[PDB]
């Protein structure tokens, strides 16, 4: 399984952002709104291939979560679809970026702003977000935002759609890597 692939929890479907590790322990990153209140994660709709269990979740305020792999056999590619990822980096205005998600696949665009606040309502407010003109649709949450071989962010939310165009905000990946003490591989 790689970045962008579907992940299923008891509640719904999200997308895997990036495969990471600390020492000999492997995990994956995804959106915190996906890990919130989720325990177990599976690789298929059937819930027959177990991936692991939630280890952390930060939402609202931030939008990152992390799942510890419990499945020994499933291959864990440090990629995004077949695109290799070798580092993480901070986003910048006008940076060309690409998103991959389980519903829409890969779409590209640019970073239009930094430090945005996004109000999802009901007290769910997230801060420090990267704004881009890349579209995203339901099921794409937590998928990777990358640039080249650089990990950039995790899909959080936005508006519009892929047919007419839209705006997507991502969580900076560096901040998530730092909080959990993990790294891309």
């Amino acid at each position: 399984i790689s970045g962008g692939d579907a992940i299923y929890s008891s509640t719904g479907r999200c997308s895997l952002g990036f495969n990471v590790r600390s020492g000999s322990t492997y995990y994956f990153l995804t959106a915190g709104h996906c890990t919130d209140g989720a325990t177990t994660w599976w690789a298929n709709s059937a819930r027959t291939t177990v991936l692991g269990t939630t280890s952390g979740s930060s939402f609202p305020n931030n939008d990152y979560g992390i799942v510890r792999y419990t499945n020994t056999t499933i291959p864990k590619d440090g990629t995004v679809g077949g695109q290799d990822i070798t580092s993480a980096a901070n986003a910048t205005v006008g940076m060309a970026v690409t998103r991959r998600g389980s519903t829409t696949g890969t779409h590209s665009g640019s970073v239009t702003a930094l430090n945005a606040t996004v109000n999802y309502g009901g007290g769910d407010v997230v801060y420090g977000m990267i704004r881009t003109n890349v579209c995203a649709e339901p099921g794409d949450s937590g998928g990777p935002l990358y640039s080249g071989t650089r990990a950039i962010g995790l899909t959080s939310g936005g508006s519009g759609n892929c047919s007419s165009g839209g705006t997507t905000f991502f969580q900076p990946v560096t901040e998530a890597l730092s909080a959990y003490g993990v790294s891309v591989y």
Binding site: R13, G101, Y120, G122, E137, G139, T155, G157, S159
Partner: protein, 51 residues
């Protein structure tokens, strides 16, 4: 699902589909409720799940 508090400037993008009265499958409640507003209250919920 009640959409009174809509619209919302943005929606998270997890997938838990609802089936609209326009036979469209809406990927999540936020997406659906924003479409109700945009419809000016003409779109309704058919059932939960894919259409």
């Amino acid at each position: 699902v009640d959409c009174s508090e809509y619209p919302k400037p943005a929606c998270t993008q997890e997938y838990r589909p609802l089936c609209g009265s326009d036979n469209k499958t809406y990927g999540n409640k936020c997406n659906f409720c924003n479409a109700v507003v945009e419809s000016n209250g003409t779109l309704t919920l058919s059932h939960f799940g894919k259409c």
